[PDB]
Amino acid sequence: PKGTIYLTFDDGPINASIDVINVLNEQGVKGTFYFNAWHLDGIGDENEDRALEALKLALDTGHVVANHSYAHMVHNCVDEFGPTSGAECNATGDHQINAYQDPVYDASTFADNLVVFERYLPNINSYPNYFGEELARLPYTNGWRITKDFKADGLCATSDDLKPWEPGYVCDLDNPSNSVKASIEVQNILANKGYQTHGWDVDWSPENWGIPMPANSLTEAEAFLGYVDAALNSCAPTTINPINSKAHGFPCGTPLHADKVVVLTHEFLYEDGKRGMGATQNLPKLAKFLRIAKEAGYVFDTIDNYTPVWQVGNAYAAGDYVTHSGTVYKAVTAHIAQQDWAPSSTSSLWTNADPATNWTLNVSYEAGDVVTYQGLRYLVNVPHVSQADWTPNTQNTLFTALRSHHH
Ligand SMILES: CC(=O)N[C@H]1[C@H](O[C@H]2[C@H](O)[C@@H](N)[C@H](O)O[C@@H]2CO)O[C@H](CO)[C@@H](O)[C@@H]1O
Ligand code: NA
Ligand SMILES: [Zn+2]
After folding, report:
1. Do 3-305 and 310-354 show the same overall fold?
2. Shortest CA distance to 23 belongs to which of 282, 362, 227, 222?
3. Annotated binding site for Mg(2+)
4. Most exposed among 81, 140, 195, 262, judged by the fewest C-beta atoms under 10 Å?
């Protein structure tokens, strides 16, 4: 194969998710679904009476369910969040304005999302393809938290004033909006809870979200495969338009991203309704795209395999990344994996390479890294691999507390 496509769908579960899933299942393709549980509660202002049926269908036919927050940060679009807020915000179109405010509360709505999933589907954690606690994507934001050395933030994704498609909109990369700054902190909070977050390379979408009837203006399947081709190994998260879709700081050429294209789309574009004739026009586009992409040599996979799962018998070069029991590790030395030598907090073959910033065991720390431990921040003074006896509060040579006189 020439590469791997990760088809990802945002903002379900809604009635239209069932039609999208039915298209995928007809060709055996598995997608990753970034869900918002407010649709299960019936307050997300979509056709969503079949939301629970859509959630069950995704899980029952092998698609990966991931965490997109409870209500897509719409509490930040209105004065008081309630059952009608999704409709109120749809009437203004103001979703991107002040979309992130208090990052601790905003991050907490990812945790709320899981509480609601597990209420509506009590056996959801018996599904191996339920990744709600481990994989996330931030509303509006092409931001990434993959490894300790693979992060990116959408520095123009959300605004304090104008929508990014309005003519007077200005983004200053050196002084981002307060909403952007808050979304960066949200990324960091999730990473410390063990999430990875994934953005996207290409977006099957209207040119910009100010276009009326945005389901009517979707790229044809053949032209869209051309966009996927152009994104392969070209650092598309940094070059994508419009400016609010860019992932600034994305590490071009990073090995984990080689030969991969993450595709974003939204199931609500595949419905005949308020956004246009999306079912009539775009479900055939999606079906055709699956066929022509496979014919061109792409394979489809889900985001849980984007960072490959550690496997007995695999061959790892020094520096290769895996996940093991949901934690990211980096190989210390080239080796062939054996069943009794899995990655761990004490393994000599691996170090923990989670994108988290709390102090953690068995991390390869570099001078200048900042860790949090027992509620205090410390600078790493000298590179080392952390271990249980070298906690920051006990090692003045390795760490300097940001409140110490040694700083
Ligand atoms: C116009 C429209 O359909 N808006 C919906 C909104 O879409 C947002 C996407 O989720 C983001 N990925 C993108 O960056 O910005 C668009 C536009 O705001 O999503 C919300 C939540 O599902 C929905 O309520 C809006 O109708
Ligand atoms: Na994790
Ligand atoms: Zn979304």
Report:
1. no
2. 282
3. 134, 158, 194, 326
4. 81
CB 72 near ligand 1, within 6 Å: yes
User: Which atom of ligand 1 has the smallest separation from the CA of 96?
Assistant: 18
End-to-end CA separation in angstroms for the chain:
52
Instruction: Provide the resolution (angstroms).
Output: 1.9
Looking at 3.20.20.370, 3.10.20.90, 3.30.300.30, 3.40.50.1110, the CATH number of the domain 3-305 comes to 3.20.20.370
Q: 200 has which bridge partners?
A: none
Q: Tell me how many degrees the CA angle 241-279-302 measures, rounded to the nearest 5.
A: 60
Q: Is the peptide bond before 383 cis (omega within 30 degrees of 0)?
A: no
Evaluate: CB of 68 within 6 angstroms of ligand 1: no
> Ligand 3 centre and the CA of 352: distance in Å?
30
Inter-residue contact 26 to 282 (CB < 8 Å): no
CATH fold label, 310-354: Seminal Fluid Protein  PDC-109 (Domain B) (2.10.10)
Domain 357-407: assigned CATH number:
2.10.10.90
Q: Which helix (H) or strand (E) holds 328?
A: strand 327-331
Q: Is 140 in the pocket of ligand 1 (CB under 6 A)?
A: yes
Closest atom of ligand 1 to 46 CA is 24
Span from the CA of 95 to the centroid of ligand 1 (angstroms): 7
Breakpoints of the chain, after residues (C–N > 2.5 Å): none
Give the pair of three-digit tokens for residue 39: 């649709």
Residues having C-beta closer than 5 Å to ion ligand 3: 10-11, 139
Q: Which of 11, 180, 264 to mutate to test the pocket of ligand 1 (most atoms within 8 A of CB)?
A: 11
Q: Residue ranges of the domains in the chain?
A: 3-305, 310-354, 357-407
